Amino acid sequence: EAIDKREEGIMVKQPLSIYKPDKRGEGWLKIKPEYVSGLMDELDILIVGGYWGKGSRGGMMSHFLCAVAEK
DNA sequence: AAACATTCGTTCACGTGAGTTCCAGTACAAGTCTGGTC
């Protein structure tokens, strides 16, 4: 239904769960279409440019600029 | 009366179960890099 209404996803919560600051995966869960395999459309695009990287990956092209073709 | 077969307590090797140490696989959390717009 969320996919029908063009929404991000759904959340599932446990009724007997207390509040715990800064804690993940205790009583709250999320489901998005991306997390389910096959439910998304993927794009095949070309790499037309590159950028240099920051500290952990310095002397290599870390991010890229992609382009689609013209019929 | 003498020779041969059987039996018995002993011995060794080999196999299997339980305890201990070490390492690989798994899980989770935090850190680091990136993307997009307003």
From Swiss-Prot:
It is found in: Nucleus. ATP binds at E8, K13, K30, K32. Mg(2+) 2 binds at E8. It comes from the Eukaryota. Testis, thymus, prostate and heart. Belongs to the ATP-dependent DNA ligase family. DNA ligase involved in DNA non-homologous end joining (NHEJ); required for double-strand break (DSB) repair and V(D)J recombination. Catalyzes the NHEJ ligation step of the broken DNA during DSB repair by resealing the DNA breaks after the gap filling is completed. Joins single-strand breaks in a double-stranded polydeoxynucleotide in an ATP-dependent reaction. LIG4 is mechanistically flexible: it can ligate nicks as well as compatible DNA overhangs alone, while in the presence of XRCC4, it can ligate ends with 2-nucleotides (nt) microhomology and 1-nt gaps. It is linked to LIG4 syndrome: Characterized by immunodeficiency and developmental and growth delay. Patients display unusual facial features, microcephaly, growth and/or developmental delay, pancytopenia, and various skin abnormalities. Interacts with XRCC4; the LIG4-XRCC4 subcomplex has a 1:2 stoichiometry and XRCC4 is required for LIG4 stability. Component of the core long-range non-homologous end joining (NHEJ) complex (also named DNA-PK complex) composed of PRKDC, LIG4, XRCC4, XRCC6/Ku70, XRCC5/Ku86 and NHEJ1/XLF. Additional component of the NHEJ complex includes PAXX. Following autophosphorylation, PRKDC dissociates from DNA, leading to formation of the short-range NHEJ complex, composed of LIG4, XRCC4, XRCC6/Ku70, XRCC5/Ku86 and NHEJ1/XLF. Interacts with DCLRE1C; the interaction is direct. Interacts with APLF. This is DNA ligase 4. The lineage of its organism: Eukaryota, Metazoa, Chordata, Craniata, Vertebrata. The gene is LIG4. The chain holds residues 420 to 490 of 911 of the full protein.
